[PDB]
Design a protein around this ligand. Structure first.
Ligand code: IK0
Ligand code: MG
Ligand code: ZN
Length: 312
């Protein structure tokens, strides 16, 4: 049969958490298929249907600085590395669902926050009052799954199909960072009082939610030159949103005001201390083989501290 194979450097480095998928857009579909085949199996999906799905998913990502097709594949590769390091912890349906959820999690993103849509009074904010963009990403995911020749889950039973679409729905909603803070607090308590139980479905859901946040923020877990250059894309978006806030007559938050360019190093420090380090710390407590993510995050925090100290 038709296994995908990558050049040697990619075949070895794709297994590491800090892998960068590279600037060759046309290799990203094959990288994703490679990851499905090893994390799920060559039997998981029909190749023709899977390729058609990947290509329609790509076409539904917009040409924005950060929440684009490269972000989708990057977040899928981090999930691949988590799954491969935790072989026996995940059901067959979770392996199938979670790489798709990661590829789909920002479908049709416009480069604006939930809060900008609510202040603009975008129609999506009337359709979906919370997790506005995330309910949209899941809606786009189901749309693409229902196109002719695109049902990659066609061999699942009714109830198995409904279970995989529910894994995907919850995984995509969990990428709303507003939801992460309480999810991580609850997981911290359950781990520390030893109530955490992976046979409890509502516990798994929380653990998958945290994995989704970890994959989504995995820019902070890369080699420093990748982390630093990715931050430029992340701010290009925020700062355009700031501009759009100022056009509505609203002062943006500091994170989104290009007038505060000079404070970026201190804003990154805050973000590693308030979001990233807590995220990968709680993830490593629950799933010990993810420790390389925490280590890499701490390495980047220390690089941001050097930037502030004028050593870079
Ligand atoms: C959901 N993700 C995020 O919201 C997110 C935010 C930031 C922005 C961090 C931030 N900067 C600043 N300002 C204040 C004035 C100058 C700079 N204030 N703050 C909190 N970086 N970032 C990364 C790298 C990644 C992966 N994700 C992020
Ligand atoms: Mg998102
Ligand atoms: Zn994302």
């Amino acid at each position: 049969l038709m296994q995908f194979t990558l050049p040697v450097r990619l075949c070895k480095e794709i297994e590491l958490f800090h892998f960068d998928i590279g600037p060759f857009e046309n290799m990203w579909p094959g990288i994703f298929v490679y990851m499905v085949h090893r994390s799920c199996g060559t039997s998981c999906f029909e190749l023709e249907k899977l390729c058609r799905f990947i290509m329609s998913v790509k076409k539904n990502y917009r040409r924005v600085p950060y929440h684009n097709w490269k972000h989708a594949v990057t977040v899928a590769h981090c999930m691949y590395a988590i799954l491969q390091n935790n072989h026996t912890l995940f059901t067959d349906l979770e392996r199938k669902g979670l790489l798709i959820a990661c590829l789909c999690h920002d479908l049709d993103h416009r480069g604006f926050s939930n809060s900008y849509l609510q202040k603009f009074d975008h129609p999506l904010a009337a359709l979906y009052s919370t997790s506005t963009m995330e309910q949209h990403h899941f809606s786009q995911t189901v749309s693409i799954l229902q196109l002719e020749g695109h049902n990659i889950f066609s061999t699942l039973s009714s109830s198995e199909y409904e279970q995989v679409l529910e894994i995907i729905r919850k995984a995509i909603i969990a990428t709303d960072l507003a939801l992460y803070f309480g999810n991580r607090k609850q997981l911290e308590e359950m781990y520390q009082t030893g109530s955490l139980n992976l046979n409890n479905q509502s516990h798994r859901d929380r653990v998958i939610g945290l994995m989704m946040t970890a994959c989504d923020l995995c820019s902070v877990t890369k080699l420093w030159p990748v982390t630093k250059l990715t931050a430029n894309d992340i701010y290009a978006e925020f700062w355009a949103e700031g501009d759009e806030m100022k056009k509505l007559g609203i002062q943006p938050i500091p994170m989104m005001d290009r007038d505060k360019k000079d404070e970026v190093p201190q804003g990154q420090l805050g973000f590693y201390n308030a979001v990233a380090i807590p995220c990968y710390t709680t993830l490593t407590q629950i799933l010990p083989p993810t420790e390389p993510l925490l280590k890499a995050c701490r390495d980047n925090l220390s690089q941001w501290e050097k930037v502030i100290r004028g050593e870079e």
